Amino acid sequence: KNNTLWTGPKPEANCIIEYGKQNPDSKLTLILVKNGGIVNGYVTLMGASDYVNTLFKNKNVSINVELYFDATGHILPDSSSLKTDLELKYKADFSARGFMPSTTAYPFDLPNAGTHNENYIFGQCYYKASDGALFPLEVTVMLNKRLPDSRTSYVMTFLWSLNAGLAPETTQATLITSPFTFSYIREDD
Amino acid sequence: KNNTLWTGPKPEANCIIEYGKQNPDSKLTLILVKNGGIVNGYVTLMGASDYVNTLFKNKNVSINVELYFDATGHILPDSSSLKTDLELKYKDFSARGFMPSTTAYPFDLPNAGTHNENYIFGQCYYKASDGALFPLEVTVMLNKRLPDSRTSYVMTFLWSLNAGLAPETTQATLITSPFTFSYIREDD
Amino acid sequence: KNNTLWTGPKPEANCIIEYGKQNPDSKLTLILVKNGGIVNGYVTLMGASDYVNTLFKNKNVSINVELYFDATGHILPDSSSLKTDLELKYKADFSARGFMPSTTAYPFDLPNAGTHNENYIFGQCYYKASDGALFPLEVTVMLNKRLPDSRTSYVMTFLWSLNAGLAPETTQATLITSPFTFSYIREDD
């Protein structure tokens, strides 16, 4: 009851990966579930353009998704990679502050006070290549460390890194990052 | 509170690994917990036969567990590796809400298309009798292909050992360390 | 709703790492959330002494945290690494038995019977070095193999291992283990 904030189970292209592109080129599935004092997160990315679906023709690739939220936990679409706000599973006015990363646990760096390296979550997911070969993707989640502007209250970024000895593909193949799950200390409701 | 569908915390031999065997040869612990729009899963396998407990005498091993469910999320024991249906933590009723979403994880349709979004990959470990720790590459396949006309949902597990040397030279209880995963669940 | 037993989102030094030290030298963040028949755990360690914050000047380091609980799931501070009991996020006169690792799933070994290897959870987290290098830490969780004494009912230990070919640091830097998440079969409420 009021505990899931997401993109939907199978969204249409809603995310921009290629710098300078005006329209979505990928499908970001992001699910944030409230579970006690923590949020259980689920993230997957699917390519929806020739650019995104040919990135894995290279053995060294970095994919960035930046999410910026206002004071009531709503996506700022102008600056964020995700161009459509998240919605509640049973949805439409509401405060999604309780789904946000805690500024107590994950603070914002202050000039001359030193960096907050406790704001990163590292893990791994995979890319299953068209030939069936399995490539690991190194994942970095950064919570609130640095703001992009004066309009943002919370930050959640994702980075998928491919660092292989050989390229996964020689042709266009749908980019799919296997589901990556993570948990963080949430802000007060 | 109607949110855990499981095998029990420490089940008796309930799963068949060896092809052609008629009776259980392993103990599958599977816990499926409803948590908002997702299911939080927990899986571990323990060997319960000489065959299963001597598999790790080889450097290359694949262990497959196939689970097939009906329209109300109940195990089809004839076709599944698990020979006993899952049960709620408190005593029927529909387990549809614990099933993998056919929207998020569809079934491949004959012309053009594989749904590679139906795989969850991760890792767990085998602690050998000598104390060496071996990684096991885990693949979970949700839906994607049906075995027959009786099945509505699919959940398969594969544990792969691909080592430079065999973990064992003798029989030792096979134990895969706990593997946790999450998936978008079907409507209640 | 009585479902989170934790240290707090950002605790003060509450843990002892250095053998023979009498006062806390580290900050252990431990969050235990009840979710059906399982507990969803979250653990992070931050150094709070010159000793702990110079451990990564070595390429081979092992960090151990031992937690011993009574029959009602309360920390025994005399023997445990954590020197302050866990508390409920919302609700001190409570029972935390339901947050404990199951003695059915994770039994205690018996003399001459051969060990319970089902009691371990293995995984990985990282240390982000002052120069941005990312070092993996091999994590082992134990749960209930052996009791330290006649006062303990439940056990939960953590081991972070660094086994690098070079040292992450040449100077003092705050030790931070990136968030490690795990799940275990819980005891009855």
Q: Are B70 and B33 in contact (CB under 8 A)?
A: no
Q: Distance (Å, rounded) from C-alpha B98 to C-alpha B86?
A: 11
Please, which residues bridge with residue C176 across strands? C46
Listed by the residue before each break, gaps in chain B with C–N over 2.5 Å are 91
Query: In Å, how far is B13's CA from the nearest CA of chain A?
Result: 31
DSSP class per residue in C72-102: TS-B-TTTSSB-S--EES-------GGGSBP
DSSP 8-state symbol, B5: E
Q: Smallest Cβ distance to C9: which of A117, A182, A185?
A: A185
DSSP 8-state symbol, C105: T
Query: Is there a contact between A38 and C35 if contact means CB atoms under 8 Å apart?
Result: no
In this complex, is the C-beta atom of B35 within 8 Å of any C-beta atom belonging to chain A? Answer: yes
Residue C132 dihedral angles phi and psi, to the nearest 5°: 85, 0
Q: Distance (Å, rounded) from C-alpha B107 to C-alpha B145?
A: 6
Which residue in C8, C48, C79, C59 sits closest to C174, CA to CA?
A: C48
Q: Distance (Å, rounded) from C-alpha C94 to C-alpha A70?
A: 37
- Please report, in angstroms and rounded to a whole number, the separation of the first and last CA atoms in chain A: 13
Element at C41 (helix H, strand E): strand C38-47
Please, which residues bridge with residue A41 across strands? A32, A182
State both tokens at C129: 């070095």
Query: Is there a contact between A29 and B120 if contact means CB atoms under 8 Å apart?
Result: no
Burial classification of residue C83, based on how many CB atoms lie within 10 Å of its CB (0-12 exposed, 13-18 middle, 19 or more buried): middle
CB atoms within 10 A of CB B97: 17
Which residue in C155, C139, C146 sits closest to C187, CA to CA?
A: C155
Which residue in B134, B179, B125, B176 sits closest to B155, CA to CA?
A: B179
State both tokens at B8: 């029990």
State both tokens at C8: 């707090």
CATH code for the domain in which residue B141 is found: 2.60.90.10
Where in the sequence is the domain holding C111, given as residue range(s)? 1-189
Element at B183 (helix H, strand E): strand B179-184
Q: Which of C2, C26, C32, C42 is the best mutation test for A, with the most CBs of A within 10 A?
A: C42
Which residue in A168, A174, A178 sits closest to A56, CA to CA?
A: A168
Burial classification of residue A166, based on how many CB atoms lie within 10 Å of its CB (0-12 exposed, 13-18 middle, 19 or more buried): exposed
Contacts of A120 (CB under 8 A, 6+ apart): A140, A141, A142, A143, A145, C128, C178
Q: Are C34 and C1 in contact (CB under 8 A)?
A: no
| Total domains in the fold of chain C | 1
Query: In Å, how far is C148's CA from the nearest CA of chain A?
Result: 31
In this complex, is the C-beta atom of C58 within 8 Å of any C-beta atom belonging to chain A? Answer: no
State both tokens at B109: 């349709």
Listed by the residue before each break, gaps in chain C with C–N over 2.5 Å are 91
State both tokens at B37: 């729009």
Sheet strands side by side (includes B133-142) = B60-69, B153-162, B133-142, B119-127
Which residue in B163, B178, B161, B128 sits closest to B61, CA to CA?
A: B161
Experimental approach was: X-ray
Residue B116 dihedral angles phi and psi, to the nearest 5°: -75, 0
Question: Dihedral, CA atoms, A124, A159, C34, C92, nearest 10 degrees?
Answer: 120
Q: Which of B182, B183, B185 is the best mutation test for A, with the most CBs of A within 10 A?
A: B182
Contacts of A151 (CB under 8 A, 6+ apart): A68, A70, A76, A79
Q: Distance (Å, rounded) from C-alpha A61 to C-alpha B43?
A: 32
Please, which residues bridge with residue A15 across strands? A26, A82
Residue A120 dihedral angles phi and psi, to the nearest 5°: -110, 140
Q: Are B161 and B59 in contact (CB under 8 A)?
A: yes
Q: Smallest Cβ distance to C4: which of A36, A118, A120?
A: A36
Ramachandran class of C143: left when φ > 0, alpha when ψ lies in -120 to 50, beta otherwise: left
Q: Distance (Å, rounded) from C-alpha B61 to C-alpha B44?
A: 16
Query: In Å, how far is A36's CA from the nearest CA of chain C?
Result: 5
Q: Distance (Å, rounded) from C-alpha C158 to C-alpha A49?
A: 44
Query: In Å, how far is A172's CA from the nearest CA of chain C?
Result: 31
In this complex, is the C-beta atom of A2 within 8 Å of any C-beta atom belonging to chain C? Answer: no
DSSP 8-state symbol, C109: P
Q: Are A116 and A110 in contact (CB under 8 A)?
A: no
Residue C47 dihedral angles phi and psi, to the nearest 5°: -70, 140
Which residue in B145, B180, B10 sits closest to B68, CA to CA?
A: B145
Q: Distance (Å, rounded) from C-alpha C68 to C-alpha C81?
A: 9
Q: Distance (Å, rounded) from C-alpha A25 to C-alpha A11?
A: 12
Cα-based distances in Å from C62 to C22, C160, C173: 20, 6, 17
Using DSSP, state whether B43 is helix, strand or coil.
Answer: strand
Q: Distance (Å, rounded) from C-alpha A75 to C-alpha A152?
A: 9
State both tokens at B187: 């409507």
Q: Smallest Cβ distance to C185: which of B31, B46, B124?
A: B31
In this complex, is the C-beta atom of B59 within 8 Å of any C-beta atom belonging to chain C? Answer: no
Residue A176 dihedral angles phi and psi, to the nearest 5°: -140, 120
Q: Smallest Cβ distance to C122: which of B9, B33, B133?
A: B133
Which residue in A122, A128, A126 sits closest to A158, CA to CA?
A: A122
State both tokens at C143: 């749960």
Q: Taking a contact as any Cβ pair under 8 Å apart, which residues of chain A between 119 and 158 contact chain C?
A: 120-122
